[PDB]
Amino acid sequence: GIDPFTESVLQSQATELLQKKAQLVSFKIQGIMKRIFMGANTLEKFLSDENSAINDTLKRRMLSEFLLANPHVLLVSAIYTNNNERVITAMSMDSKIAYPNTTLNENMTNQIRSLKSITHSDPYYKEVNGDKIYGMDITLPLMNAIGALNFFLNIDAFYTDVVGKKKSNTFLMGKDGRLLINPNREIQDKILSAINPDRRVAKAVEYYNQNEAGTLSYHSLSGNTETFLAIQPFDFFEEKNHWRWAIGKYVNKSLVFK
């Protein structure tokens, strides 16, 4: 406390460690998401093939295998709009893969036929078997499009990837400071600046918007104290803003400085 040398050393050490840990979490998430999108690309080639010996049954098998390999995906749907309009859906709930019957509504329909690049929805709670599951829809055009591939990314399935096996001071942030994952589940889907008066939050969101890693001092909700907070932004999808998340990790100044 009394010593500026010690303080500088301890601070620098603690904020470097914070950033290192946040980078590891984000790298793990990116790896998970890379596998999702690679598989979705593979599925798109099979589901959109002109001259296929593949019937709806074998399409179902491949969709269910996608789910087996990617447990962070709750369901996946091959939606055809061209002719013989139909929805083929595999869904993974509990440990069993079902094939619910979806009828294509005019809501989904035209959005799909004019679709010419990948999109995603805003995060939302989907009701399933009386439970709300936090996630988002991701939609790829079946290629001029003959229909669409849609899957529901289960954001809740990333809970342990973000927070760890033990509770920790780690969260996943989305657009404008929205909390996608938080150890305190009840502040999920909340805007951070709307539930935290600390105006240094803006600098967090700004690190996010600028897309570089950075640290800042920050008053936490879960600890109600002064912390260092690291922000690690990363794209959860790569094309060549819209597909950007960030890991937040923080530590009590009272702990850093003895």
Author numbering: 28 to 170, 175 to 271, 276 to 293
What do the paper's sentences say?
In this paper, we report the crystal structure of LBD of H. pylori TlpC in complex with a small-molecule ligand that co-purified with the protein. The three-dimensional structure of recombinant H. pylori TlpC LBD (residues 34–297 plus six additional residues (GIDPFT) at the N-terminus, introduced as an artifact of the cloning procedure), was determined by X-ray crystallography using a single-wavelength anomalous dispersion (SAD) technique to a resolution of 2.2 Å. The TlpC LBD crystals (hereafter referred to as form A) belonged to the space group C2, with three molecules in the asymmetric unit related to each other by a three-fold pseudo-symmetry. The ligand was bound to the membrane-proximal subdomain. Based on the analysis of the electron density maps and the chemical nature of the ligand-binding pocket, we hypothesised and confirmed the ligand to be lactate. The lactate binding site is located in a pocket formed by residues F202, L210, N213, I218, L223, Y249, L252, S253, and Y285. The carboxyl and hydroxyl groups of lactate form hydrogen bonds with the side chains of N213, Y249 and Y285, and with the main-chain amides of L252 and S253. The TlpC LBD/lactate complex is further stabilised by hydrophobic interactions between the methyl group of lactate and the side chains of F202, L210, I218 and L223. ITC measurements demonstrated that each of the N213A, I218A, Y285A and Y249F substitutions abolished the binding of lactate to TlpC LBD. Our analysis of the structural basis of lactate recognition by H. pylori chemoreceptor TlpC changes this paradigm regarding the mechanism of sensing by dCACHE domain by providing the first example where direct sensing of the signal molecule is mediated by the ligand binding to the membrane-proximal, rather than membrane-distal, subdomain.
